[model samples]
Target: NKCDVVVVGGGISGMAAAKLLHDSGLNVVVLEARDRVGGRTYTLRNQKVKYVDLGGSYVGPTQNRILRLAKELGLETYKVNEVERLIHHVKGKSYPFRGPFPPVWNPITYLDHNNFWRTMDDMGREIPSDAPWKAPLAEEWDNMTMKELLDKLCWTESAKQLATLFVNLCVTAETHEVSALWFLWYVKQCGGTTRIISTTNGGQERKFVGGSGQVSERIMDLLGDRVKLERPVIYIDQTRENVLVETLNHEMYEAKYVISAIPPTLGMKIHFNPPLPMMRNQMITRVPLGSVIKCIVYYKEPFWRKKDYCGTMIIDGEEAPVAYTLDDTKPEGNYAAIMGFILAHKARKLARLTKEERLKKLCELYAKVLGSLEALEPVHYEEKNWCEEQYSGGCYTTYFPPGILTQYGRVLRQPVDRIYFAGTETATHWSGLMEGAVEAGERAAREILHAMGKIPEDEIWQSEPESVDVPAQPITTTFLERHLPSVPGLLRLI
Candidate 1:
């Protein structure tokens, strides 16, 4: 019942934070509501070959904390099979495009595309991840939603449609639901907007050789039973000497300090004795979680590669369960997998259907996208509806609505007496990724150390934002042919 610290949420963020406390010689206990740990890093080992990650998977060069920790745990990463081009599905047409720029159907659409993203690049430069609300035009920017920003673009009919698709890809939420200033802050955290918005040389480059969840599993192994499973924190009461916590099973726990690393929005589920201040409550309530249903379809081999299709699909202005897909085929692994996202209203609408129906529709839709008539069946199919999860209401990350950032963003990391906050959303850099979770954990651990006179007030937890690396860049096909002996002389398609 008594320990030096109590960690709530057994996800990567909580695990990292609690690990630091234990290393500092504090007696700590991690209370997790779920039957297992890993949070959104859910790995499905039920697959025959290497397991597939149904949740957060890919990591790039710019993404540091997780990559560093993965290597430290003796884990290795492999590059995702590079694709030549992506299929742009619009209204009903699927067009192909290559390189950094998207396809241009009309001449004027080119101007609209350039003007829009150029404006975004300039605006993104102004919002620093650490203090987005403190930007020179902070108040002016915070009140506008990304939808407002899009309206100002004066995009052509074609470009406007393309613009909306890219915006949806960025946050999984349509532009109308996200804040302009907050989007800039998010872009800054993801190594800049262009990097986050691109495929090659961007955030979707490589993945762990095993599975992303293995990183969290290794950390939990280091801590052992210090992390208690099936112990959901139902209540927390901050006291002068200790913080009292209770689990769903009616078990009670007491610790000198408490670190809550659960999703900020989900934090409201637990009751507080004295009641949290109105600002904290309001901030938590105002920020809504994103909606996503990540699905993976397996095939006998990399069939799309044989057709030179790249396997990347963006159904421009489309619905969920088939909105998008990345080339998820392993470089050397035998099986070919299609990792797709069902986002926003599509996720909501499709959530009504049973799993079997969803699978049937997805299989048919994928076959249509591939242009392959036969053997459309997957040996296996898995879908993780994050919105249905009690702990994780969504995947990828959450977002801020208009005006919420400036109205009450400062209290995000502020503690309530002995109760502290640690989550990707509260982090200063990479704010919505596994990397951000690690950084936030380390930051919370340092704060606790400083509070206890263990570290200096001026100490930096893991040093400044991870040094940027060569973003996600791919080589030419000739280079690939020279280095990769396994690639067949496949015919190119339009």
Candidate 2:
């Protein structure tokens, strides 16, 4: 098989890339490893409920790429209603109540929520709204982890617990694993964490009119016959003349360039001829993609809402298997859905358990919080375990153990010979999100377009000439200058 371009991975990133390139009059082929598209954006309808987002839910107004795409595709989106009530479970006590929001109890709230926002507002005051990334604080804040900055603030126990829930629930990882800098950056990007909370309509968080899957389906529709499903690329070899790709089904094809939209960990599974550069190999091995298990439970009615609950729950007890919940009752009266999340370590544990064991455990936990498990008992339960899937390996990308994000994140995104990488993980903006996947896809498409001389380099926003030099000294010097100050006399030793 041959085409102007071959995109490996039919998720949002690959589909978006192929669609853009194909729309531009170039022959594009999208090879999806799985039987379907959407990658992490999986949606399904069961028990008469409208399509529910089973993966990558929640789209904000400011998430430009996804918002714009949704508009262009005519996907309907609804604003999330104000959460009526929130119950926080800590030390086996359920603090369920209405209004009078509590002040953030953490020591870091003084800095992160107060001082940090104030400083960012002042610095960003001069930056044009269009150029928020140019704000002076962007780079400086990148060096610290959220926990380190929080420790500096000396948070109260209650505050610490609240902060822990926020980080673990949203980012799908523990507090210690996330960079304080990245957390601040996210807050800055989204205007504030609170503004980022609204969900897309349909009782579920944001999604395509029918479902988030429509985005992927539209891309495939545009590609027409160029998409090949169930064709998992097992190996990629680049020669001086062209690139060769082999699929799991023993299919072989050649193209001028190969765009790998697979996750970093999954990418490691595909053998690269002559072996990938040592740095690239290290990134694949060392940088872990974050995992999450999202289970949507269908019910006969919106039972929790009768008690004035928004179906949102946050439990911190060791026995609480779920981190958070959302009231997903659609307007059509099709039946309500309860969306819950289990992150990284917890998700892996659940995935490894038998279905009966897992369901029983989840019901037991639900019974403790909601007063009864009967109404909440799902008519049927659906789950997607990305971690166990050989093709995906995880749901979204996250900052890895120390070295990966700080030391090798950029390198992981860089092109290797005739092979290029693009995914949510490689995106500069909105990394680890659907918007990031689209942004990265558009970027990779333009890369191939420019490489084929179909478009001028200047026209592509993400285009970087092969000869562009990225300075290493500035990175090292900047790291030392910002981090060294906090280390006391360490500079003299160096």
Candidate 3:
């Protein structure tokens, strides 16, 4: 097929770009590998477990792009329970924890919590999300891993555990997986360390009415025949006049410009025409996607609510597949949904096991963590590991290890000839978020339109959002609030 632009990977970012380009009267074709839309924004549901967002769940006040898109799609959102009473599973015991802090495990935990975030906040002030390599001490910071920093700095086991949780649970990567600059820059993009970590005014503040996938599906519905599904592009050949893309089944597409909206991990799997630069290939190798398996368990009733427990549980050890579990109950309350994230190596391990074994173990873990035997027996259960998906390699976005950003960071987003990049990973604000994906899509579309002289500079799309435009509150609220593993900056070194 011939077109003005060809969008590869029909996820939120690609769809978003296609929607805008189509609205401007440009002939665009979206080629999706999956049979349906919503690349990482997959929603799984059944008779009992209803509408579970396996990927890209939740949004809030500061997520301008997603919120605006939700509104345009005529979708509504609801706030998470955010129960003040949360459970922290420490040393195989379900401890009733209030707010973010666990029961004063050690003085080091408190000290580490306050000192780490404060230092990160200071460092965040020095970094720009758009260009993290330019931050003060960028080279030194990027040269070391978070595991190295925490090991060198933390005084006790509890302090290190608190630090590890931030990377694994919140950032979706292990301590040794990310660099100091990457962590600091991530928090900077989401406003502050605390802002990104909070369930109130932050990332997990709100939920889509029906399901997150509905947004992408709705966009595809608008595109009609322009969107193609189950067509995976295996090769791309670009020339001075047009770019050529071929799918796995020998289908070919031609366009003046091409937008690759997939991650570097998945993007690198495809063959390039002229063989991309060595630097580009090296950068792709450096940007690793963090592993995570989103799971949901359905119950007959809202059992935890009877005890005034908000149904939030954080398993503080490596034994359980689920790192964090929270209530995803809809407003109707006819059915109860408990959503969780099984992160890191655990996800990779469990993903290899039988579904029955995984579900059985998950049930046992949930029951133990929530202090309710009812959790051991769910009416229904569901989970999706993004890594196993045909085209998607990981979830909750990708990260950089030591020195990767400095060596190849700039090229991550820079356009290569007639090819442009668009993904949540490529976004500046709210990177690794659905909001970031939408904003990135708009930015790419606008860039191409403006270059084509189809739109004036003033009419072009803008992507920068107010850095964490959340309602102001005290930095340190409760005893544990400061200690909670919320953002990438949960680090303090003395």
Candidate 4:
């Protein structure tokens, strides 16, 4: 079968792209490797309670595209209450700390929590807010790993551990592995950490009223029959005349343009005829995705909330099991939910354990933090390990040791022949979040439209190709000095 466009991967990016193209009067076909459609945004429905969201749980304001789409679709959103108090367990001692605390408790922790935003804000002050990449030093920051940058900061031991935990939650990998600049860019793109930290003001921290899966449903609804399910593209051959896509089951489909929305790591598995360009291939091989395990435990009632606890905890032990916990229960509901995140190496190890063993271990960890297991003895527990998924293989993009974001990330997003890449990883803003995925899809759709002669290339919204007027601001030396601390010396030389 043939269509105007073939979108590979049923994730939000592909789905959003397919919907946009179809709405533009183009025939679109979506190919998904997995049986489900949400990709990393899967929601577990079979649990004892009517719970959802096993992947990519939260959405927030400033997540413009996703939020706009949700509102347009009449999807409801609920505020994710801030963690009233954070319990940090370190070196056999657990300390409970409140928000607006001092940064001196742990240097690495302070760096981890603030470094990304601080650097981003510093660099962003130079770059036109609309064109972050245009910052003169943007490419330089991309050259070093987050760990190397941390070392340069000379953070104390406690600070380093705190930084590690923060990275674990954001990148889902060790701090040493991620690109230092990419982290900063992410913070800048999302606004700032200060805004992100305070939920009181509208910021990039929110969740769907029910679950994130509603996003997938909304996008799919827009696409209607244009989106196909259970059609996994196993091979892609891009030529000047047409792009050929073959599903794993050997179903052949053709299109004028192909937008691959799958993760680069998974995209490499599909055979690309004439092969991909060397740089593109290098990116697919080098860019890493962090493995993530998301576990949801449903309780009979909101026990922790009753104790003035916000159902949030930040533990600092090797056996901490759950790095961060949240209350997923809705207002005026007795049934409560606790969601925990485990990343990369730890998730891989846990994936090898039996279901019972995993449950027992989680219970033990919870009992220690909450001071009782009786309330946590839930009606049911469910987990989704992205690493174990054959198609996904991991959760979201993370940095690698000595990672170069500009080197690999730029090449990965570059189109080869008639093929274009679109995913959260390739997003210019908010890369690891759902907002990134949506923005990437919009960008890819515009690219395809331009290629098909449906729209002029100059009409696309890119900082480089089409110039938009940006306001002028006074260039201050102090601003430069403040951000210079975040920029590595070697990056400045670059």
* Candidate that would win on lDDT: 3
How do the predictions measure up, each by TM-score?
0.91, 0.80, 0.92, 0.85
Q: How many backbone clashes does candidate 3 have?
A: 3
TM-score (C-alpha) between model 4 and the true structure: 0.85
lDDT of 1 by residue, 359-426 (tens): 87877877777777532777777888888888877876778899989888888888888888888888
Poorest stretch of ten by lDDT in candidate 4? 465-474
Residue range 166-188, candidate 4, lDDT tens digits: 66776788766677667666565
What local lDDT score does residue 297 receive in model 2, on the 0 to 100 scale? Answer: 71
Q: For model 2, what is the C-alpha lDDT against the true structure?
A: 0.65
Q: Clashing pairs in model 4?
A: 59-206, 107-159, 108-159, 108-160, 109-159, 177-399, 177-400, 178-399
Error of 3 at 142 (Å): 1.1
Q: Which 10 consecutive residues of model 1 have the lowest summed lDDT?
A: 485-494
Q: Write the per-residue lDDT of candidate 2 for residues 131-218, one digit (tens) a residue.
A: 3234465445445566665565432445556566666765677667765555554444444444433333111244455678888877
- Is 2 or 3 the stronger prediction by lDDT? 3
Candidate 4 runs further than 4 Å off: 100-143, 195-204, 373-376, 398-400, 462-494
**Angstrom error at residue 248, model 3:** 1.7
**Residue lDDT tens for model 3, 1-494:** 99999999899999999998999999999999889999889877665655678788888767888877767888888878866577778789877767554556454466665666666677888998789999878999999998987776665677678668777976778888899889888878987766777677667777887889988999999999999998898998975468998998788999988888998778777899788888897788778778888888888887888766777887778888887888888868756868888898888888888877888888888877777898877887787887777577777888888888888889877888888889888888888889889988888888889889887888655744543433335455455644554333344321
lDDT (Cα) of model 4: 0.69
Which order, best to worst by lDDT? 3, 1, 4, 2
RMSD of each: 7.4, 8.5, 3.8, 5.8
Better of 1 and 2 by TM-score: 1
Count of steric clashes across candidates, in order: 3, 11, 3, 8
After the best TM-score superposition of candidate 2, give how far the Cα of residue 58 lies from its true spot, in angstroms: 1.9
